[PDB]
Amino acid sequence: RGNLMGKRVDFSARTVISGDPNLELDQVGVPKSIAKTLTYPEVVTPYNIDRLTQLVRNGPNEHPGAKYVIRDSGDRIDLRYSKRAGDIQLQYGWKVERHIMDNDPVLFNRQPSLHKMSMMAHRVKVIPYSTFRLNLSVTSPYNADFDGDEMNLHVPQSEETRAELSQL
Amino acid sequence: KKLMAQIFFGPTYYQRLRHMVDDKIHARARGPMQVLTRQPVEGRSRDGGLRFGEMERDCMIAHGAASFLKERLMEASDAFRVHICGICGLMTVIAKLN
Amino acid sequence: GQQYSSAPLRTVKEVQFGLFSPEEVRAISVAKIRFPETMDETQTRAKIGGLNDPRLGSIDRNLKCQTCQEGMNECPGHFGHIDLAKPVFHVGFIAKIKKVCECVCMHCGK
Amino acid sequence: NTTVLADEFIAHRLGLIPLQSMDIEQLEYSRDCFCEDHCDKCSVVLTLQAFGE
Amino acid sequence: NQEDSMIMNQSSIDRGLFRSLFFRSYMDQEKKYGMSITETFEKPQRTNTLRMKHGTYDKLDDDGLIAPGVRVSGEDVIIGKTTPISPDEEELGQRTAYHSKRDASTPLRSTENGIVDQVLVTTNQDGLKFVKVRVRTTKIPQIGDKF
Amino acid sequence: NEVFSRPEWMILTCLPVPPPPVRPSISFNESQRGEDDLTFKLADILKANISLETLE
Amino acid sequence: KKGIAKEHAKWGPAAAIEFEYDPWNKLKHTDYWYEQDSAKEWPQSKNCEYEDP
Amino acid sequence: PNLNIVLTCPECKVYPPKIVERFSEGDVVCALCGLVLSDKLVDTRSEWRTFNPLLDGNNLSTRIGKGETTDMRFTKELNKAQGKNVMDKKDNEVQAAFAKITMLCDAAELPKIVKDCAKEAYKLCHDEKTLKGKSMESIMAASILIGCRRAEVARTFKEIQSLIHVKTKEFGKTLNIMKNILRGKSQNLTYIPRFCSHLGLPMQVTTSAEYTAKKCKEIKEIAGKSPITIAVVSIYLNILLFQIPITAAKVGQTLQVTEGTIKSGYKILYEHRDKLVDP
Amino acid sequence: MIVPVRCFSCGKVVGDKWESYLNLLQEDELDEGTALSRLGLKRYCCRRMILTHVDLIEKFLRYNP
Amino acid sequence: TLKYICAECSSKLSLSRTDAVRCKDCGHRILLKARTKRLVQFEAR
Ligand SMILES: [Mg+2]
Ligand SMILES: [Zn+2]
Ligand SMILES: [Zn+2]
Ligand SMILES: [Zn+2]
Ligand SMILES: [Zn+2]
Ligand SMILES: [Zn+2]
Ligand SMILES: [Zn+2]
Ligand SMILES: [Zn+2]
């Protein structure tokens, strides 16, 4: 029960959820600290070589940045202590792990979760403070109320599971 | 502009509880593992991850997403590589692959 | 993040459940484990031939686990054994064996 | 500070104290002045010394 | 305001409304196993101390403690304590080069921050020199706070 | 089934010993070392086995 | 240091600002709630002296 | 045979591992090129949460007691089986000796540090050849006195002698050869507050007898004649300097000191009264 | 505690009205509403401050430092 | 040496190392550490 059917997993965040009518139905407001803590490994492609290069040149401190690089050899270089080296140029076939920006679907859940509606994907909108902001048209399938209720947020780490998670 | 409906307005005694957001918000992305099961630890002070229990897996089966379940139960948690033998399916295969 | 292996990668299909034969236990094990002590007499390393010797697996990362080499994040483990001079019964089978004792003769074994 | 009150509490109470602000038009901001920290162009220095007799 | 939500005036918060103080006490104690090994409160040097945490040790004094009033943040060591080790006991990594001792300090919480309020040192029942620390932190009412 | 199960195999004669990857011991402060319960049970099996062999 | 009230409430020189308009309700901006009659429950404001019903 | 894993950076290879360990991320990284050296870091604090080599060694054992649902016949058969295997090891003397020493130390109201030092001393001696007997009483008394001398505590020979009848002489010989054992395995001031506690004297008389004890240790003449009499005559002078009355008979029958000895020391002490004044 | 500075709404300075307030209470023996009417407070937002204040600094000063 | 303060009588001890933990003139073993002599900057916000 505690090691096969279920388990404690990484790439998740738990905090108090609150309402925000200015947001959309499917979105969710994620705090900046959670967006900088969690990450997502993206594959370097000629379509986003300049953008990922900018994320590398920004640093892990800034939100539009990265955290770790993975060369094609299967080796991870941390951006921290990498500025002491000087320059890091990306090539085709690498995997740079960026922070959670906008338009990133992540699974949203609230225990005990007895519905299949209690776990639903959402589009990340980066907002300050520390509470998960969401629209009030989604609190009825979650059976939640804005009185100290915490929720869980899981992040997919692959493009295949992200697309399959967005289409289902 | 004046509001159309009058508002019930007056002082009221309130109290502040122990529950605060600064002692609740936490996120984990690749942290320390336990010594027994080599799984993410339990507790916010130990930099622990959230629990993907049985009901969550049952919901993932209800949605029909098997790739996200496999990734969540392998790469997102713990993934081990072992060698088994053809005649007997036990893990007695000594592997000296240097 | 583990080391690459040249063995063919396949999925796990059929799983067979069976009892462990003593001969197969002796064929899988590598050590006999005779000393009830944990570590060595010098209060360091391992007892070498005891409850937790380098012939089994190891932790603490720094140790190499003699018979797999590699590290603890790679070591599946290794099995020892205990050769008894008097046969004992298994708990989960005490009933079943008893039923067998009520299904077969106690002399000619028929 | 030997008071029974907290330090940042006293700093808060001092922060709530009003001051005179007439000729504040010709006092430049802290970010606008090119000096380091402060100078007689941005801020006014005050002090407090109290002792029970 | 929907679903038991409340809107609070910001100008009232800035003037000190529902602002509270939190006092966290970190108690540490040195012990002796078989008299041969004696834990000692001291400032660990980055040259001969093994297993030292990545936190900063500039806020510690000569006795291995932080004087009250020093602003501390997370991942900061409040009480420095070292344990004697044996050369032929582990010899892990660089233990055969540091020779001296092993770090075993008690730092502040990772997410916490504030100003050390009071620090006191006293011998307990069996005469072991223990030290208690108390750090204060004003928690301004935030959006995520409950009422 | 002959290839998998035998009534002779139901009676325990030799006992497998699992590696510490199953029962990870701890050495805390180099002077407070804790061993798992299965380790103590193996010690009991060894003391009882050697004792029985000595008495026999 | 100099600052406006947008940075902190301590830079607030003004206090309670009494804003009012249209004493005798003729612009039809508020529909008064009444249990029996609105003229017997709702009292008259001071500025009503400067106009007329 | 080797078995020593040493982490090095194949890209840097310019110096032995001068690395940093990131515990929050669970990695170890070279502090130069920033390249990680290992992922998935294990913890020592987390495995310790569920839970003595210095004394018990590497020996393991488990108790057998009665169960929730069991019979009293099986509990006796298992304990009698261990009673026949108790001769396989000669460690029954350590548990019984530590039990009786535990009873004596708990009877003397000594701290746990002196108990652990005495147990460690008895473990260092144990069963050697130079001991050659002493009927288990003298090694226990001498071990308690050794554990008292190691923990900076002060206990007179007449106190342990009042606890255990060790006949003094054989106690002195066993303590001497035991001290030789301790030297082969490589201060009267503390008595003043204890006797001041026996008499219930203020702190000024205690520190006054401290300065008087040190000064009398510096003046020479008589030197000591055992430090106990120097302590009792020092407290006697420091109490005859004030007005709290105890006389010589009460302090002689409470501290077990001869009146003629405290007067014999009070004579020359009164002769050296000049340089003993603190204020 | 020890007389809240300003007010928690309007923003008017009230800290200089405590000493007079008590002075009007212990000398003139007037009521609370009359004293608050003499201090110049015309809104209940201020009135709740002086009326509901629990001065605990007096019980804090009785401890030796 | 470092400056210490007594629990009850609040006297300046300033005892060095290897002097145990005990006040001089009185037997209160509670010894204060005293506040740092350097300035601490705060913000009124
Ligand atoms: Mg709720
Ligand atoms: Zn095989
Ligand atoms: Zn292995
Ligand atoms: Zn300036
Ligand atoms: Zn060889
Ligand atoms: Zn490197
Ligand atoms: Zn007001
Ligand atoms: Zn004092």
CATH value at residue H210? 1.10.472.10
Q: Which residues contact H123 (CB under 8 A, 6 or more apart)?
A: H55, H94
Beta bridge partners of E115: E71, E136
Q: How far is the centre of ligand 4, averaged over its atoms, from the C-alpha of D39 (Å)?
A: 4
Please give all residues whose CB falls under 5 A of ion ligand 4, grouped by chain where several chains appear. D 33, 35, 39, 41-42
The C-alpha atoms of residue A40 and residue B75 are separated, in whole angstroms, by 13
Among residues B44, A9, A78, which one has the least CA distance to residue E110? B44
> For residue A114, what are the CA distances in angstroms to A6, C19, E64, F13?
15, 39, 53, 49
Do residue E142 and residue B14 have CB atoms under 8 angstroms apart? Answer: no
Give me A16's structure tokens.
């108090």
Give me A17's structure tokens.
């959820």
C75 is in an annotated binding site: yes
Amino acid identity of residue D16, one-letter, is: L
Q: How far is the centre of ligand 5, averaged over its atoms, from the C-alpha of H1 (Å)?
A: 9
Q: Is A24 helix (H, G, I), strand (E, B) or coil?
A: coil
Q: Which residues of J touch E14 (CB under 8 A)?
A: 45
Amino acid identity of residue E126, one-letter, is: D
Burial class (CB in 10 A: 0-12, 13-18, 19+), G50: exposed
Concerning whether E4 is annotated as a catalytic residue, the answer is yes
Residue H219 belongs to domain spanning: 190-271
H or E element that contains A33? helix A32-37
The C-alpha atoms of residue H63 and residue A48 are separated, in whole angstroms, by 66
Residue J13 belongs to domain spanning: 3-45
User: Does residue D22 contact residue G13 with C-beta atoms inside 8 Å?
Assistant: no
- Phi then psi for residue I40, to 5 deg, are 110, 5
**CB under 8 Å, gap of 24 or more: what pairs does H111-114 form?**
H111/E126, H111/E127, H111/H151, H111/H153, H112/E126, H113/E32, H113/E35, H113/E126, H113/E127, H113/H151, H114/H144, H114/H147, H114/H148, H114/H151, H114/H153
User: Does residue E137 contact residue A9 with C-beta atoms inside 8 Å?
Assistant: no
Give me G51's structure tokens.
């106009």
First to last CA, chain F: 35
**E strand intervals along chain E:** 20-29, 40-41, 49-50, 71-72, 77-79, 81-84, 101-103, 106-107, 114-123, 129-139
β-pairing, F11-17 vs A7-8, is unpaired
Do residue D4 and residue I61 have CB atoms under 8 angstroms apart? Answer: yes
β-pairing, A150-154 vs A27-30, is unpaired
Give DSSP secondary structure letters for chain H.
---------TTT-SSS--EEEETTTTEEEETTT-BEEE-S---SHHHHS---HHHHTT---------SS--HHHHHHHHHHHHHSGGGSS-HHHHHHHHHHHHHHHHHT--HHHHHHHHHHHHHHSS-TTT--GGGTHHHHHHHHHHHHHTT----HHHHHHHS---SHHHHHHHHHHHHHHHH----TTHHHHHHHHHT--HHHHHHHHHHHHHHHHH-SS--SSHHHHHHHHHHHHHHSSS---HHHHHHHHTT--HHHHHHHHHHHHHT-GGG---
Other CB atoms within 10 A of residue C18 CB = 12
> For residue C43, what are the CA distances in angstroms to C62, E97, G45, H187?
17, 21, 92, 36
The C-alpha atoms of residue C41 and residue C55 are separated, in whole angstroms, by 17
H or E element that contains B28? strand B26-28
A145 is in an annotated binding site: yes
Quick one: DSSP state of residue G43? P
Q: Which chains touch F (3 or more CB pairs under 8 A)?
A: B, C, E, H
Fold of A11-37+101-168: Barwin-like endoglucanases (2.40.40)
Quick one: DSSP state of residue A96? E
Q: Which residues of D touch I7 (CB under 8 A)?
A: none
Q: Is E45 helix (H, G, I), strand (E, B) or coil?
A: coil
Q: Which residues of E touch D10 (CB under 8 A)?
A: none
Q: Closest-lying ligand to the alpha carbon of H203?
A: 8
The C-alpha atoms of residue C96 and residue C102 are separated, in whole angstroms, by 10
Q: Taken in order F38, F44, F48, F50, is the CA torsion positive or negative?
A: positive
Dihedral of CA atoms H45, H50, H54, H56 in degrees, nearest 10, equals: -160
Q: How far is the centre of ligand 7, averaged over its atoms, from the C-alpha of I8 (Å)?
A: 6
The C-alpha atoms of residue G16 and residue E11 are separated, in whole angstroms, by 13
Amino acid identity of residue D21, one-letter, is: S
Give me H130's structure tokens.
């130079």
User: Does residue B49 contact residue A10 with C-beta atoms inside 8 Å?
Assistant: yes
User: Does residue A158 contact residue A40 with C-beta atoms inside 8 Å?
Assistant: no
Q: Closest-lying ligand to the alpha carbon of A151?
A: 1
CATH architecture of A38-100: 2-Layer Sandwich (3.30)
Among residues E90, A123, E144, I49, which one has the least CA distance to residue C43? E90
The C-alpha atoms of residue A156 and residue E127 are separated, in whole angstroms, by 55
> For residue C48, what are the CA distances in angstroms to C44, C52, C65, E16?
11, 8, 12, 67
Q: Which residues of C touch E93 (CB under 8 A)?
A: 62
D20 close contact with G: CB closer than 8 A: no
Amino acid identity of residue G12, one-letter, is: G
> For residue G15, what are the CA distances in angstroms to B55, G5, G7, G28, I10?
56, 12, 17, 29, 5
Closest chain B C-alpha to F50 CA, distance in angstroms: 28
The C-alpha atoms of residue B26 and residue B49 are separated, in whole angstroms, by 9
First to last CA, chain D: 16
User: Does residue E139 contact residue D6 with C-beta atoms inside 8 Å?
Assistant: no
Biggest CA pair distance of chain F: 52
Strand order through the sheet with H27-30: H19-22, H27-30, H36-38
The C-alpha atoms of residue E98 and residue E108 are separated, in whole angstroms, by 26
Q: Which residues contact D7 (CB under 8 A, 6 or more apart)?
A: D1, E69, E115, J40, J42
Q: Is D26 helix (H, G, I), strand (E, B) or coil?
A: helix
CB-side neighbour CA atoms (13 Å) of H10? 2
H34 close contact with C: CB closer than 8 A: no
The C-alpha atoms of residue H261 and residue H268 are separated, in whole angstroms, by 11
The C-alpha atoms of residue E104 and residue E53 are separated, in whole angstroms, by 9
Quick one: DSSP state of residue G50? G
Q: Which residues contact E140 (CB under 8 A, 6 or more apart)?
A: E13, E19
CATH of B33-98, one of 2.40.30.10, 3.40.50.720, 3.90.1800.10, 3.10.450.50: 3.90.1800.10
Give me C87's structure tokens.
């046969």
Quick one: DSSP state of residue C93? G
> For residue E34, what are the CA distances in angstroms to A113, B33, E29, E39, E107?
53, 33, 16, 11, 26
Give DSSP secondary structure letters for J1-45.
----EESSS--B----TTS-S--SSS----EE----SS-------
Q: Is E72 helix (H, G, I), strand (E, B) or coil?
A: strand
I33 close contact with E: CB closer than 8 A: no
Nearest residue in D to E117, CA atom: D6
Domains A11-37+101-168 and A38-100 share a fold: no
Backbone φ/ψ region at A59: left (φ over 0), alpha (ψ -120 to 50), beta: left
The C-alpha atoms of residue E81 and residue E77 are separated, in whole angstroms, by 10
The answer to whether B and G touch (≥3 CB pairs < 8 Å) is yes
Nearest residue in A to E4, CA atom: A146
Closest chain I C-alpha to G12 CA, distance in angstroms: 8
Identified catalytic residue from E4, E58, E88, E126: E4
Q: Which residues contact H89 (CB under 8 A, 6 or more apart)?
A: H59
Q: Closest-lying ligand to the alpha carbon of H2?
A: 5
B15 close contact with E: CB closer than 8 A: yes
The C-alpha atoms of residue G23 and residue G28 are separated, in whole angstroms, by 11
Give me H179's structure tokens.
């001290």
Number of domains observed in the structure of chain J: 1
- Phi then psi for residue J12, to 5 deg, are -85, 115
Closest partner CB to A77 (pick from H31, H34, H39): H34
Give me H62's structure tokens.
């488990």
Q: Is E61 helix (H, G, I), strand (E, B) or coil?
A: coil
Among residues F51, A151, I22, which one has the least CA distance to residue H61? F51
The C-alpha atoms of residue I64 and residue G52 are separated, in whole angstroms, by 67
Nearest residue in A to E111, CA atom: A33
Other CB atoms within 10 A of residue H158 CB = 12
Q: How far is the centre of ligand 2, averaged over its atoms, from the C-alpha of G2 (Å)?
A: 81
The answer to whether E and I touch (≥3 CB pairs < 8 Å) is yes
Q: What approach was used to elucidate this structure? A: cryo-EM
Closest chain G C-alpha to I15 CA, distance in angstroms: 15
> For residue H271, what are the CA distances in angstroms to A77, G16, H274?
83, 88, 8
Closest chain B C-alpha to F2 CA, distance in angstroms: 15
Give me G48's structure tokens.
């009503």
Do residue A6 and residue B52 have CB atoms under 8 angstroms apart? Answer: yes
First to last CA, chain B: 80
Closest partner CB to E147 (pick from B16, B22, B26): B16
Amino acid identity of residue H201, one-letter, is: L
Give me J30's structure tokens.
């509670």
H or E element that contains E15? none
> For residue C89, what are the CA distances in angstroms to C65, C92, F1?
33, 9, 20
Nearest residue in B to H25, CA atom: B31
The C-alpha atoms of residue H275 and residue H211 are separated, in whole angstroms, by 11
I11 close contact with E: CB closer than 8 A: yes
Name which of C41, C44, C45 to mutate to probe chain E: the one with the most chain E Cβ atoms within 10 A of its Cβ.
Answer: C44
Q: Is C25 helix (H, G, I), strand (E, B) or coil?
A: helix
Q: Is G42 helix (H, G, I), strand (E, B) or coil?
A: coil
User: Does residue A155 contact residue A106 with C-beta atoms inside 8 Å?
Assistant: yes
Closest chain G C-alpha to E144 CA, distance in angstroms: 20
The C-alpha atoms of residue A106 and residue H133 are separated, in whole angstroms, by 78
The C-alpha atoms of residue H157 and residue H172 are separated, in whole angstroms, by 10
H or E element that contains A124? strand A119-126
Fold of I1-65: Arc Repressor Mutant, subunit A (1.10.10)
In I1-65, where does DSSP find H-type helix?
Answer: 18-28, 32-39, 44-51, 57-61
The C-alpha atoms of residue H197 and residue I16 are separated, in whole angstroms, by 58
First to last CA, chain H: 71
